A paper describes a structure:
We next determined high-resolution structures of MCPyV [name] in complex with three different sialylated oligosaccharides derived from the in vitro binding partner GT1b. This disaccharide motif binds to a shallow binding site on the outer surface of [name], which is formed entirely by residues of the BC-, DE- and HI-loops of one [name] monomer. In all instances where ligand was bound, the α2,3-glycosidic linkage between Neu5Ac and Gal adopts the same conformation (torsion angles of −54° and −6°) that is preferred in solution and that is also found in complexes of mPyV [name], hemagglutinins of influenza A viruses and wheat-germ agglutinin with linear α2,3-sialylated oligosaccharides. Neu5Ac forms the major contact point with MCPyV as it contributes most interactions and is best defined by electron density. Most of its protruding functional groups are engaged by the protein. Its carboxyl group forms a salt bridge and hydrogen bonds with K299 and S297 in the HI-loop and water-mediated hydrogen bonds with D145 and S297. The Neu5Ac N-acetyl group faces away from the fivefold axis, interacting with residues in the BC-loop. It makes hydrophobic interactions with the side chains of W76 and Y81 and hydrogen bonds with D82, which forms a salt bridge with K295. Furthermore, the O4 hydroxyl group of Neu5Ac interacts with Y143 and D145 in the DE-loop via a water molecule. The Gal residue does not contact the protein directly and exhibits elevated temperature factors, but can be docked unambiguously into the electron density.
The human [name] (MCPyV or MCV) was discovered in 2008 and found to be clonally integrated into [name] carcinomas (MCCs), establishing it as the first human oncovirus from the polyomavirus family. Polyomavirus infectious entry is initiated by the major capsid protein [name], which attaches to cellular receptors to promote internalization and transport of the viral genome into the nucleus for replication. MCPyV [name] is a symmetric ring-shaped homopentamer with the five [name] monomers arranged around a central five-fold axis.
Numbering used by the authors:
A (entry chain C): 40 to 71, 73 to 319
B (entry chain D): 40 to 70, 73 to 112, 119 to 190, 193 to 319
C (entry chain E): 40 to 112, 119 to 189, 193 to 319
D (entry chain B): 41 to 319
E (entry chain A): 41 to 112, 119 to 189, 193 to 319
Write the structure that this text describes.
Amino acid sequence: VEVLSVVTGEDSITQIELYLNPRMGVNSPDLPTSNWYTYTYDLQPKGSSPDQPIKENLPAYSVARVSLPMLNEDITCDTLQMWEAISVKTEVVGISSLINVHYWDMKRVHDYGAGIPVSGVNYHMFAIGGEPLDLQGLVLDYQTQYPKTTNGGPITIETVLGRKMTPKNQGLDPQAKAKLDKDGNYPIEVWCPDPSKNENSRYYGSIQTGSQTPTVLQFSNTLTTVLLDENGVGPLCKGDGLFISCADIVGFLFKTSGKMALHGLPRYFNVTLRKRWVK
Amino acid sequence: VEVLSVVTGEDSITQIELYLNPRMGVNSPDLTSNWYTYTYDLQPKGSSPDQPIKENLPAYSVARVSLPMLNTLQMWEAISVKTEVVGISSLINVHYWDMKRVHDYGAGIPVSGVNYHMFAIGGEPLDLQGLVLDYQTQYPKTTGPITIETVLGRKMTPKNQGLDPQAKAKLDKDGNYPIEVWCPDPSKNENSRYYGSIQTGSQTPTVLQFSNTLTTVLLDENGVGPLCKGDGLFISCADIVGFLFKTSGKMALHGLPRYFNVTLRKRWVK
Amino acid sequence: VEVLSVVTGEDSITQIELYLNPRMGVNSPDLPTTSNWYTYTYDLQPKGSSPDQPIKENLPAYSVARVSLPMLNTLQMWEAISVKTEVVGISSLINVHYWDMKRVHDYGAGIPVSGVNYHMFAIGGEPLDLQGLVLDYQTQYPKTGPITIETVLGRKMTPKNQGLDPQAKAKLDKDGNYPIEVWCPDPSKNENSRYYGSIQTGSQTPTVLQFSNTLTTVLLDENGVGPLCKGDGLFISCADIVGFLFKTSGKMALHGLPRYFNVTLRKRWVK
Amino acid sequence: EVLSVVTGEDSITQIELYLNPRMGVNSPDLPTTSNWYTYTYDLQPKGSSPDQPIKENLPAYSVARVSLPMLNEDITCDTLQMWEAISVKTEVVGISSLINVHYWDMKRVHDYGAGIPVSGVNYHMFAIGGEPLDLQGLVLDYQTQYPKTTNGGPITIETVLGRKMTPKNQGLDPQAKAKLDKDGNYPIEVWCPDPSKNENSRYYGSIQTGSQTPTVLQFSNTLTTVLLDENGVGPLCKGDGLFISCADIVGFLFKTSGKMALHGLPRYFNVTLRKRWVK
Amino acid sequence: EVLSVVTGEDSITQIELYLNPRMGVNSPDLPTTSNWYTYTYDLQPKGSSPDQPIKENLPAYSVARVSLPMLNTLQMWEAISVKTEVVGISSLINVHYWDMKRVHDYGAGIPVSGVNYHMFAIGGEPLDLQGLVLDYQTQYPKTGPITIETVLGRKMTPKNQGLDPQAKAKLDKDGNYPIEVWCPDPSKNENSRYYGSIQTGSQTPTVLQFSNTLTTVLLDENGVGPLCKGDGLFISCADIVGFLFKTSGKMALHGLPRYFNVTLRKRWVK
Ligand SMILES: CC(=O)N[C@@H]1[C@@H](O)[C@H](O[C@@H]2O[C@H](CO)[C@H](O)[C@H](O[C@]3(C(=O)O)C[C@H](O)[C@@H](NC(C)=O)[C@H]([C@H](O)[C@H](O)CO)O3)[C@H]2O)[C@@H](CO)O[C@H]1O
Ligand SMILES: CC(=O)N[C@H]1[C@H]([C@H](O)[C@H](O)CO)O[C@@](O)(C(=O)O)C[C@@H]1O
Ligand SMILES: [Cl-]
Ligand SMILES: [Cl-]
Ligand SMILES: [Cl-]
Ligand SMILES: [Cl-]
Ligand SMILES: [Cl-]
């Protein structure tokens, strides 16, 4: 997979724009329950063993594969052009919507007060790759009984192993590995990016725990992420496909009853790519 | 529009100064004006639906600045800006007559909690994307703030809790675009620069800086700043600085004004 | 004033040292009657009925000094090029055993000085330009005592003074006289001054401060010019509120610390 | 004496590994107790003197020695080639797992609410060296009776001194030194890196105390730590051994009863080494 | 006058030391009270005036003078850089001190947290100190701690709540100068470098870093480090890391030792 020179010429640079809507558990706006689109259901400890969480309570990674302009007339040549992602402008959309402290069923911060704003657990990541993101499985509790389904979601450790989790899945088990190849099917609480692979991807992420911790976010269209590695090489899109992945949990909606649901926001991407000779 | 060379000469540079007063809900000091720079009391009803009043919807400030007329032609290019939140010091006041106390015999709870800060400099209106916390929120009809129902010509659906590419607007009117409804559209705004932050929480400290030594460069990666179409410079902002906590337990958001000093140069364009 | 070249010669550079003591409300230590509360306010409380009629002891104000510089005289002016500045006495805030300190819980230590912080300093060749803006326009500040928006306008504040009112302007020409809660630096003026500040609200928010004698602030603008001292006077201004003293009864007073300055100045030709 | 970097073909090599946390329950393989793998047991003040902590409540450092390819045919020569560690990409794995706020026995934040997220005390460090990490002993309370090493306990200050601790071990006792040469046997609360030694190691660490303090962690495969010193020399691997140490405490699991247990996450390393001539 | 840096074979030396914290119980070698070494006694507002704090409740600065090899227009050692580290940070993960107050019933102990104070100084003479106290009516013990009364020879007046030019001392004795009374004097200390911070609050997270890759450069703006008068290097510090919370509700401040490795070079001076 030898990288040669950057292609020179007129249309050697292109731009790819897209947005990814969050997949928090209620993943569709088009259902007769869709009122909770971009939210989970109510998150509660069961109180007895074992936990059997519902799919609505399992926020999942967003992913899209973007098809790119075909570059090579004869694909049997050793030396071909490939799209190389060199930079990205990315932004969490709808941040301002979180100033709303008057949702009708918001728990009031104290008697007669404004609602507790969306706050608490945050998880924020994005990835740009020339192939699916590689995932490592690890869970808080190996005894958790994740939903078994027939329609390909959610995919968890039991799904990939073809057998029950054992205690080692609370740590790093090299067999618990997957590719982020489907939108809204790989739960955040089960899968993280695999740092031992992903040579052809760049990812950036953070978590914030706490129950009412401030959600603190910036947005600016002046911010650019360079996607080049130390050798000056960005992700190379094999099969003329650009993989874009993300997750943006922005906190809890505090309901009057005391119930709490996690909330997510969409993410925008503008990826600059260039043509690169490879061998 | 292809960008040519920067113009050289004696009157090549100019500086535009302005301030923008906050539009929190009570938007005029010349009327109920006692609550100017504040909302009314923000309070989840406990029952459905939510029908917020106009006084409870903080909105973006905006001004179009007419620039000296110039005229393949010359356009004004915004190259840098000094901007500052004005009146930050007023927030040390912990003795508002009706301020809720931190405890018995204590000082008032200081303005703190939800902050939202943004400013934009552009050569056309700021492009907005609509997204709401709850699509069932019934905003007042435009007679009146502009919201998603106004632009769509029909009610919101669940998709307006996410990114609906139809929910788009332009920031063309001062005090009319609710902050909780509209955010800068990153898919557009090629000819504007915007910078913003949010801080959620109820008594989360308000932490702000001020200095006249701080400059924001508005040039893009190619060395080109926003280009002022029809000789109009668009200046937009929002500066929510937290809640005024009242004795009863009621709470209102508060805003502060923003000052701008924009440096512009003449630029040949085709 | 057109700025020419930096003067060359043996004694073209001078250094100015000073400290400013905080003006928190009880502004003097020399009153045998009430100076125990020097560097603090009195007890800050919401009145519970309208209007607020705050006392002078509850209005922290800016510190100011004009420093006389050597007479030089198209003429020469002193140009401030850098400053080393420090909040003095930061270590005193480890004391959690003030005799009347509200305890964190039963048998525990005192609540340390914490909560509202406001820190700013300014160096200029003339008084700092101030913009007026208050939380509540119906506040009835003491008559001139402190100089407030009502003082400069010669009439009662109106709602517009809760936002930016271009008539609500003053110069910081008097020590301990301009209430911090009324006045902020005017960013529309102050071309011949450099100012830096911040605020932190919240009731018990940690007071977090640094101090080092290795930190210099460069005062030159984007054109390599520092403030130029009109009539050979250097103006230094600051405020350093460091949080609340929490008292047993529930009462709370604001506290401030002093600030030190070492300003480096050079001679500059101007026209 | 350090001489010149070796110029040649296979002059650079990469070493990949992960270390699973040793929080107290250190094996996933034990017949009965292993469900608490990556956790401590319940942490409690005894209420009477002295503290007599159990193994399971004493998080320890992770460590591995990695065998490097043999470089010298003749080991008698004055001048030899050694592996020199020059950079490392390291990442805490499984960070996303901490969004789980529905552990079956999770203490709620309030009635009907979600579980208190894993939060509070954090401790994070990693070290890359050419020899075992040098340790310095210091404890909160010198009267603490750690389980005896001979009884199958961890190695602590008493172990190294051959006698009981005295009040001076609440400060810096220059005789309370050890080397990190054993996985999950040196307690974090007893041993910190020794700054008076470790010339042939690079270490980086932080603590965060408080009970429900947000756990704030980042992850990216774009972040590289440079291991070179001020003279441009990285750790030199004695006996062809690369020493890799870490500790990643990420907070408390809050249980319904009020009981609390600390939790850790695994850490991944990718160390780049080059060949170096040494006299 | 500072001349040229000495060139030659043995011109650079390294000085290594550590300093144990002087929180109040200053010695590990006492009959029955050393169990609290590196801590204060219990800190408690009396509820009546005046405060009469005990020496066990007054954390003080650590200081050492290191003798450097003799050299003698003369040569002097010049401190050019330091690696410094707070040792024992990992010990603070212990949430099971036998008498630790719980966060809630059945819970773990409240971790060491709250007030932090961190400072270090390297110089060629003793650090210059400025006196300032929260409460000038505080009755400190006589000499033993050295406080403002000791140095003035008369009672503190209200001015000592601010900056009193007469309230000055030199940090010449280990564990004798209370932190709550003395801070580094910025009006002197030309021949020292000092770096410090405070963090207030009762349960504020203790957030500390440690790494053997961090170096502080000690040279001033002219490239000159502290010059060691009479071949003596002065090293001073303080590291309060927060409170130990006891079951009863009582609280003690706690400190940690600090390590130093100073690089010095020979410098010609007239
Ligand atoms: C059956 C009965 O009533 N017995 C009591 C016995 O409990 C008591 O001992 C004291 O009990 C209290 C209970 O809150 C504390 O546990 C005392 O311990 C501490 C404290 O936390 O207050 C421990 C702390 O470390 C000590 N501080 C220092 C600096 O050493 C303090 C301190 O010495 C005391 O508060 C005195 O200032 O004590 C514990 O001593 C005894 C003795 O009072 O009386 C029996 O009748
Ligand atoms: C500014 C000041 O001196 N405040 C003091 C007040 C007032 O003397 C009286 O309340 C009269 O208003 O009295 C206290 O006992 C109190 O209530 O806590 C102590 C406090 O320091
Ligand atoms: Cl995050
Ligand atoms: Cl913000
Ligand atoms: Cl501040
Ligand atoms: Cl940490
Ligand atoms: Cl600190």
